[PDB]
Design an enzyme around this catalytic site. Structure first.
Site, PDB file in Angstrom:
ATOM      1  N   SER A 213     -34.452 -10.404 -17.349  1.00  0.00           N
ATOM      2  CA  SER A 213     -33.904 -10.710 -16.296  1.00  0.00           C
ATOM      3  C   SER A 213     -34.560 -12.107 -15.339  1.00  0.00           C
ATOM      4  O   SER A 213     -35.556 -12.323 -15.338  1.00  0.00           O
ATOM      5  CB  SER A 213     -33.721  -9.813 -15.277  1.00  0.00           C
ATOM      6  OG  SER A 213     -34.593  -8.715 -14.906  1.00  0.00           O
TER       7      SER A 213
ATOM      8  N   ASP B 231     -25.586 -11.483  -8.385  1.00  0.00           N
ATOM      9  CA  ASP B 231     -26.929 -11.428  -8.441  1.00  0.00           C
ATOM     10  C   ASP B 231     -27.518 -12.599  -9.050  1.00  0.00           C
ATOM     11  O   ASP B 231     -27.663 -12.701 -10.395  1.00  0.00           O
ATOM     12  CB  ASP B 231     -27.101 -10.022  -9.334  1.00  0.00           C
ATOM     13  CG  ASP B 231     -28.708  -9.841  -9.792  1.00  0.00           C
ATOM     14  OD1 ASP B 231     -29.716 -10.556  -9.337  1.00  0.00           O
ATOM     15  OD2 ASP B 231     -28.612  -9.088 -10.800  1.00  0.00           O
TER      16      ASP B 231
ATOM     17  N   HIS C   9     -31.775  -9.695  -8.073  1.00  0.00           N
ATOM     18  CA  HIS C   9     -32.304  -8.392  -8.288  1.00  0.00           C
ATOM     19  C   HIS C   9     -33.571  -8.496  -8.478  1.00  0.00           C
ATOM     20  O   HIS C   9     -34.601  -7.610  -8.061  1.00  0.00           O
ATOM     21  CB  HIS C   9     -31.569  -7.387  -9.155  1.00  0.00           C
ATOM     22  CG  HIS C   9     -32.303  -7.508 -10.588  1.00  0.00           C
ATOM     23  ND1 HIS C   9     -31.372  -7.919 -11.898  1.00  0.00           N
ATOM     24  CD2 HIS C   9     -33.363  -7.383 -10.975  1.00  0.00           C
ATOM     25  CE1 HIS C   9     -31.802  -7.817 -12.919  1.00  0.00           C
ATOM     26  NE2 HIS C   9     -33.214  -7.806 -12.473  1.00  0.00           N
TER      27      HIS C   9
END
Ligand code: 0G7
Lengths: 253, 36
Positions: free
Chosen positions: A199, A99, A43
Site C-alpha cells: 500500500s 483513501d 490508511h
DNA sequence: GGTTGGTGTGGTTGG
C-alpha cells in the site's frame, strides 16, 4: 508482492518508503510526483479502527532504494515531511473509500538516476490505457504471501485491470467507482497480488504513445493476497486527480 | 506535480531516457493488443 | 547485510 519477481535497478525511480521512526519500521510504498510532492495511501497514515494515526513528525520518507532492509551507503534519500493532508471524504468506517494522501516533503530532492518523478494521468492516456485486459504492475516491499516473509529487494508483479461485474460479486464490501481491480481470472494459470505492506504503492502503466509511466492507481486493499478468485483493489488515481492538483495549487512547490 | 507535469515525468534515467527496456515492459506493451 | 563489489556506489563484517 505475491508471486512477484525482484525488480531491477530503478524499475521505479519513484518508489518511496513510508517509514515509522519509533520503533524503526516500514509502513508502505509511495510515489514521487514533485521535487517534494509524494502521494501515498491515507490508511497508511490513518486507520482509527486499528488505531492507525501516523503524523508528519513521525514518518520518514525513503526515496530511491532497492534493499528493503539496508541503507544504501549513498543511494537512499532519507527525508522529512513538512505536511500530510489526507483527502477529506476518506471513508475508513465503511470501505477504504477515497483513501488517498499527499505529504509535502520538507524540501526538494534531486532526481539522481534512481529517484525520479512519474506522470500524473491525463484524460487521454487514461481514457484508453484504463481498459480491462490491459496490464500495469504494482511495485513494493512487503509480505510475499499472507504470513510472518519480508523480502530482500523490491518485488514487482504484472497484472491486468478487472471489470466491475467481477469486483462486485467478488466481495461483500461495497465497491465505489473510486477503485478498479487488478487480478487474473482463475482459468488463467498465472497469478499475483499486492499484500499487507504494499500500500501507497504505484500501479503504473506504459503509454504506448508518449512512452512515459503514469499512476492509474494505488494499492488500497483486498481480501487476502491471491485468494484464487479474489481481487486486489487499487484506487483510481484519475477520478480523483482533481483532489490532487488542488492541494499543490494551494501549497508548496 | 499535475499531469505529465514535472517536465519529464515518468521517463526513466537508467531506462527510457537511456533507451533501455525492462525485463517485462514488453509484457504490458503487449497487453493493449499491441501498443508500440 | 552480506561473498570488501554491489548500488548498502566506499574502505573501516562496521558504520
Ligand atoms: N491482495 C492484495 N493485494 N492485498 C493487499 C491489501 C492492502 C493492505 N490492507 C489494507 O490496505 C486495508 C487497511 C485496513 C484494512 N485493509 C484491508 O485491506 C482489509 N483486508 C479489508 C478492508 C477493505 C476495505 C475496507 C475496510 C477493510 C495494505 O496494503 C495496507
Amino acid at each position: 508482492i505475491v508471486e512477484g519477481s525482484d525488480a531491477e535497478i530503478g524499475m521505479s525511480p519513484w518508489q518511496v518508503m513510508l517509514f515509522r521512526k519509533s520503533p524503526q519500521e516500514l509502513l508502505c510504498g509511495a510515489s514521487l510526483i514533485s521535487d517534494r510532492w509524494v502521494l501515498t495511501a491515507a490508511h497508511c497514515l490513518l486507520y482509527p479502527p486499528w488505531d492507525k494515526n501516523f503524523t508528519e513528525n513521525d514518518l520518514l520518507v525513503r526515496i530511491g532504494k532497492h534493499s528493503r532492509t539496508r541503507y544504501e551507503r549513498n543511494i537512499e534519500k532519507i527525508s522529512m515531511l513538512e505536511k500530510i493532508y489526507i483527502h477529506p471524504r476518506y471513508n475508513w468506517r465503511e470501505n477504504l473509500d477515497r483513501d488517498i494522501a499527499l505529504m509535502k516533503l520538507k524540501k526538494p530532492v534531486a532526481f539522481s538516476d534512481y529517484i525520479h518523478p512519474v506522470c500524473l494521468p491525463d484524460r487521454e492516456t487514461a481514457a484508453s490505457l484504463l481498459q480491462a485486459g490491459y496490464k500495469g504492475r504494482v511495485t513494493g516491499w512487503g509480505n510475499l504471501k499472507e504470513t510472518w516473509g519480508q523480502p530482500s529487494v523490491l518485488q514487482v508483479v504484472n497484472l491486468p485491470i478487472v471489470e466491475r461485474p467481477v469486483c462486485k460479486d467478488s466481495t461483500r464490501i461495497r465497491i465505489t467507482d473510486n477503485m478498479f481491480c487488478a487480478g487474473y481470472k482463475p482459468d488463467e494459470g498465472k497469478r499475483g497480488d499486492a499484500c499487507e505492506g504494499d500500500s501507497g504503492g504505484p500501479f503504473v502503466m506504459k503509454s504506448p504513445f508518449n512512452n512515459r509511466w503514469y499512476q492509474m492507481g494505488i494499492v488500497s486493499w483486498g481480501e487476502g493476497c491471491d485468494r484464487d478468485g479474489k481481487y486486489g483493489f487499487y484506487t483510481h488515481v484519475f477520478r480523483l486527480k482533481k483532489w490532487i492538483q488542488k492541494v499543490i495549487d494551494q501549497f508548496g512547490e | 506535480t499535475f499531469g505529465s507535469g514535472e517536465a519529464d515525468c515518468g521517463l526513466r534515467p537508467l531506462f527510457e531516457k537511456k533507451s533501455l527496456e525492462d525485463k517485462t515492459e514488453r509484457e504490458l506493451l503487449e497487453s493493449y493488443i499491441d501498443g508500440r
